[PDB]
Design a protein around this nucleic acid. Structure first.
Lengths: 77, 48, 73, 48
DNA sequence: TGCATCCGTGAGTCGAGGGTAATAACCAGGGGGAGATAAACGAACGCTGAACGCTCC
DNA sequence: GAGCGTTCAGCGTTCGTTTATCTCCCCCTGGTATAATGGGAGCTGTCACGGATGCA
């Protein structure tokens, strides 16, 4: 029930840096928002929320929850 | 550009014109003028 | 008008000024409107030194965001 | 509007900031929370 | 070569707010745009019925 | 056929149009014939620092 609901220490050890984490959650949040705005096209490349979602929610909040599970993977190019 | 944004804004403009100095845009203060991303933190090539 | 002020001892009305000029009062009101001078934008308000007059007047040519998106809708 | 408003502000930070802002802890994000009156409530620990 | 002088630069942070003066004055001519009246066509009407059909004795 | 029934028709018949004429004030320019012949005027004081620039 707060911003601090996914703890930061668990998130930090997954990404090994701090600046890496913010862009990584933000890139994912951009994707999931873009998925919700298909409105009927149903393009294959986009992927929806992996975890369950509240009736109203912020896409960035969903993204951070996915990192804590650790299912999502990031790679620098 | 960063030097001009400091205390002197006539002498630096005057001699730059004479010297014909091309400003490479790497740096912090000059990347705030243009609106680009500062090379510090999330603005780095590797993080972004 | 300067002579009228000195003679009559009171600020003359435009109509009495008009008959002396022999023109109509509407012409008097018109010429008074043309006889002003602009005030410079780059001037201090006087409340503080830093503030300038030119940073207090808004433009109309800017595209208001709420109206522009409504037209698309 | 007030019912709708409480729904949208949740999980959306706001950056508080005091005027001199000497050092980088001058700007700090917070989770908002609606409160009546007209004055920003702030947390006593973060005052210094 | 040393000493004297002047010139340029900088000097926190956000708040509050709107207006400034004065002297020959005229015909004379004359140009140049801004507002006022009859001619070229085609489209509403106009009676012209005429020229076709639509029912009726 | 009687008597009138719909509907093209092209034709007038001036009224439709836009398009052509033509008369007028602001605006710009030029000219005055006694003699007249080198400004008013507003300042001034922060403070340190440095480097150019003058001069003993």
């Amino acid at each position: 029930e707060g911003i601090i609901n996914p703890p930061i220490d668990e998130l930090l050890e997954a990404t090994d840096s701090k600046y890496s984490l913010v862009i990584y959650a933000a890139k994912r949040a951009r994707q999931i928002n873009a998925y919700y705005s298909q409105l009927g096209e149903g393009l294959l490349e986009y992927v929806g929320p992996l975890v369950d979602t509240h009736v109203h929610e912020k896409p960035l909040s969903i993204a951070l929850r996915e990192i804590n599970a650790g299912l999502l993977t990031s790679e620098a190019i | 550009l960063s030097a001009a944004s400091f205390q002197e804004t006539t002498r630096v403009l005057t001699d730059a014109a004479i010297n014909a100095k091309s400003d490479s845009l790497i740096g912090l203060k000059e990347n705030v003028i243009i609106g680009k991303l500062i090379p510090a933190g999330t603005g780095l090539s590797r993080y972004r | 008008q300067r002579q009228m002020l000195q003679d009559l001892g009171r600020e003359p009305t435009p109509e009495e000024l008009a008959k002396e000029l022999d023109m109509t009062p509407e012409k008097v009101i018109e010429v008074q409107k043309y006889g002003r001078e602009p005030i410079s934008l780059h001037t201090p308000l006087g409340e503080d030194g830093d503030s300038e007059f030119g940073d207090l007047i808004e433009d109309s040519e800017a595209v208001v965001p709420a109206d522009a998106v409504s037209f698309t809708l | 509007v007030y019912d709708v408003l409480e729904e949208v502000i949740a999980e959306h930070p706001v950056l508080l900031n005091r005027a001199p802002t000497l050092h980088r802890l001058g700007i700090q994000a917070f989770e908002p929370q609606l409160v009546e009156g007209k004055a920003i409530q702030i947390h006593p620990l973060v005052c210094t």
